[PDB]
Design a protein around this nucleic acid. Sequence first.
RNA 1: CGGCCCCCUGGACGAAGACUGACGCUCAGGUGCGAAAGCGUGGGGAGCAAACAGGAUUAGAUACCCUGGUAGUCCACGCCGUAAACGAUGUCGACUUGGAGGUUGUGCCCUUGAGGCGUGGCUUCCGGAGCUAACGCGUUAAGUCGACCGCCUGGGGAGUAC
RNA 2: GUAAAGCGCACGCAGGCGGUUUGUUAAGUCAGAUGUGAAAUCCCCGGGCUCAACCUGGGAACUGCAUCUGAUACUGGCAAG
Lengths: 259, 129, 225, 156, 212
Amino acid sequence: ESFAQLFEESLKEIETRPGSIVRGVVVAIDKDVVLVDAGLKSESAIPAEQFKNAQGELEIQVGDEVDVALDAVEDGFGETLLSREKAKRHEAWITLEKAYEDAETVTGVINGKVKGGFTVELNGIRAFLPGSLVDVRPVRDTLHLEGKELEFKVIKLDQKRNNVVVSRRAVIESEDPWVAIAKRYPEGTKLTGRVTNLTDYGCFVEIEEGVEGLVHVSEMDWTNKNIHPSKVVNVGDVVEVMVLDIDEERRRISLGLKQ
Amino acid sequence: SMQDPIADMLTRIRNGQAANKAAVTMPSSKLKVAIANVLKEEGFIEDFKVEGDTKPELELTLKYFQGKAVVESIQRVSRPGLRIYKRKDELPKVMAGLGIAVVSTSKGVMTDRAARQAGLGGEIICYVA
Amino acid sequence: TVSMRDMLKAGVHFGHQTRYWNPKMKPFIFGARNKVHIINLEKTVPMFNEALAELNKIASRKGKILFVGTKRAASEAVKDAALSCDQFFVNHRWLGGMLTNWKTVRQSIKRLKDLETQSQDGTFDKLTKKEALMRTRELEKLENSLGGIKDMGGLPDALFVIDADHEHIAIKEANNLGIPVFAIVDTNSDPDGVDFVIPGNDDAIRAVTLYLGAVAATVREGRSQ
Amino acid sequence: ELQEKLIAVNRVSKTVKGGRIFSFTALTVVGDGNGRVGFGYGKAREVPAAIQKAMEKARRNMINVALNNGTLQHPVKGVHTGSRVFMQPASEGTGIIAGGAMRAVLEVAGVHNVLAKAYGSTNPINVVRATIDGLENMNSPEMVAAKRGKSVEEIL
Amino acid sequence: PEIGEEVIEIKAAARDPGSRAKIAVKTNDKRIDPVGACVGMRGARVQAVSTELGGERIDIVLWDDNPAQFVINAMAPADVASIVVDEDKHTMDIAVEAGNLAQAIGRNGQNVRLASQLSGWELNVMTVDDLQAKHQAEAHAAIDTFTKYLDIDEDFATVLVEEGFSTLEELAYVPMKELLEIEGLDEPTVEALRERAKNALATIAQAQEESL
RNA sequence: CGGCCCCCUGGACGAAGACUGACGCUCAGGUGCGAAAGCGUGGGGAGCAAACAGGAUUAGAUACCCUGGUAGUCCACGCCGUAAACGAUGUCGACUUGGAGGUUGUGCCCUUGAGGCGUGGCUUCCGGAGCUAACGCGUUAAGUCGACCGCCUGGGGAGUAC
RNA sequence: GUAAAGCGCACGCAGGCGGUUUGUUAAGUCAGAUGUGAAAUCCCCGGGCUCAACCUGGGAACUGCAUCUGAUACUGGCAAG
């Protein structure tokens, strides 16, 4: 009756769009596809590579629950955008928690400055940093034991572009993209960027606040023409890329990957 | 411009029958009302309902028997471009009597059979089958 | 028989997106949630019950039921359902003109049966290797295609289908011959050819399974009767 | 009990690398002398086979027609593609006044008395189809009464 | 060959080889016509079986639906009009007219047995008048049994059994609201009179206790 | 109809209200506007380029290609009144399932963000019913109807002769 | 639309058509009557030439026009909205 109408609004009330409500129960595993059901129109064709943790083997059997992501519906049949992105929100919450007490305390091990700043990795993911943040002072972890264990103390974050730089050592110590597009510019600032779609001439890695990069086809590897990008890297993966070139005018930042 | 209201009525009805519309609405007029009443009497429609004071809206309710529509055919005969008037002997028979022909007469608008019974002809509005 | 809560749990109420729908399904739709159509369970349930009753009646008079799903997600399940009530099924690609052009396919069935016999009952082994491999391959092909319908004999007396738009060929065949059709019809699908439509999520696995299980139970009941 | 009339047979060609391959089309119609009627349009390299096919096809997909005694229930029009057809019920004794393919279908249908003209095209195939259409759409008094929620005497 | 390719549904073949061989057959509604195919051009295939194993009166009946239509079909080739029914042993009571009974019955010991196995059970060929004769021999008896059911006054019982269909024998399980339309229905008493009949049945069971 | 500016100027759409109160639709004759080429008179003339000249090509090449090159193209004021002036689809009005866009308004909504929910105008593509000889058209109809006009009646002769 | 056939586009007189409600009129419209609509011809029922053609009695028809008396739904006129 209005039973059903009340239920419809109830079920509205007890779900949300993003990957927030850990609801999808893993109802079939086979390699290389995991599948869930989060109260959506269809079941998600999940990769296995969203769900193996830090050493390469699976961690969740049948019945286990992780939320995925939404706001994109039915490319022709199916439902979702993947769940690790959901994990990105949890990582963002942990990073924000710092604000409360002005200190987020984890493990942070930064061996080398990709784009000027040491790369700091939190449990599964690894993020890239600006130079100063790796070290509180000129200490320079190159003389520290390789991949050492301290923490991360935040020096700098870009706040729209997920670039976060953190201070590994020294426990005692405690429109918009295109006007000032000179930050990752100079010649060779490398970046950690997720690829989006490979257009058979390109890969379209683009992460840094609403920009677009192309590592198109020529570099990508150390073979030129017989390469077919889909074979050689991935879909949806954070990689080594750097700028190599910027247009601020015709908005074509032409990244590379042969580096 | 709108020149023939009745014909517009009939077309609306036809389109509703085609499209399996339950009910068909349109601005009301007295002649339209009477036509609707005649149809209801002759059972091609379920019920008609006028509603409104300043600009009232006639709403007919269409009829469907075993899926398909009831009003198999509905044509104007008289039209502004060319009027048709018939004398009682000359009155027609739609579908060999199975259908009807709405005819306006001095004593009101009625089906062709009714007019014949009365003993008078008039302006042939529309055939319905 | 099948309750509304269970259907909701399964995910029947979910239906395709709002750019992929069919306006003939507008009656069966309730609303559109997050730019996805919702099927009206209030209107779905009674008709599903009806369809079940008809299927039962068919069974009671010793009717032959054919279960069609070639979605390759619920192929396993449709086969399982068919077997539970020992009825017939087409879980892989429907052969164009399986029913209309039965007489030809009947030979196909016969060849398959003969091959099966050779494989099993003969116990003759001693066959040229390549030839033996070829015969095996033929067996596999024919099993995949016509495994469920091999014991069918003639033409079914009713046709249960999991997706109308996907199996429209089978539906059209049934209509041409006049076989009763019992279709699960999502919002994108066309239900005009269907006799006993069923608005439900053809895609979701659990919903499909639920549909199948109730159908199987009512077939078994009719057989018992 | 069924009667069957081959209306027409026509030779049709297909050009190939060698030359012209000829074949034959057979347009037949069958009926039981009552409401029921069905046409078939067969094709084969030889004539008898093609007519056999036409008979087979006609025998299936038949269609019923509501006949008031020997004639029709009211004037009816039917069209198909070019062939537009008018046919009109007529008094006993008049016979089938109709031309060609149309005639044939009427006879098998078991109508005995009609006045009937084929306007437009007279392509046998299309015109027989149009006839069948006019016969199918034609409804009876009882049918219209049912449609309209009345008795037969109300409609007369 | 249609039957061979599952096109002519042939269930039972209640026939008497050496005399008459009438058998009904069903078909999936698809412009097939089962008997027609079994007969052929002017009994083309019918003649084959006619002079097959020996001069036999082979017959084909267009099976309609269920067992009710099988009854009449089993009376063919003749003219059935009506028939009675029951439970396990329904006993199809053939209801025809004397004039048509001559052919319907055909031979005392021939069509009475050939059509008996037609339905698989047994038939009881009767007459149109016979039916009515037995029909009334049933109305009086739910009454024609010394009235051992409800019972009250007799003057009211006559006026009640006038309108009463099938007497009162176990009639409480039927519509308990149409006898209230009868001129004279205040408080539930006739609805109670039927209850008395139910009590009479219990009394009859008590009589069985008197005898068992 | 295309660089900016200014001056004069026509239409369209939306938002609410307020007013008039059928004043409307169509239109034979009639009147006006009407690409390019073309004409007249007077200016102008960079580039391009009918005509023309030479060089090639070719059997020939009164062409295609190359080198030049004048009318014209440009401006002012007149005339011409035609084009595959095409959506090869007259104008006006009403009604009939959908999807994906573009553009331009406008109402509400926490714009919590580039958004969310509507509601108007114009517009591109696909496609349902229906229509169609088929191709296709398909709420911008070639569907279902009404009003008015224009036009067609085998091909040529001929849109020519008088 | 492509078969012949949408003026290149507009404005616009004459002309054609005209939202909705009430009142009135009664021109159109419808009904009835009267007068006429020559006879012959056509058609119906009959009759006479042996039949037929042919002749012939009576009817019907001559779809119209004119008038008078009504009807007023529609169209028109007039008056108010």
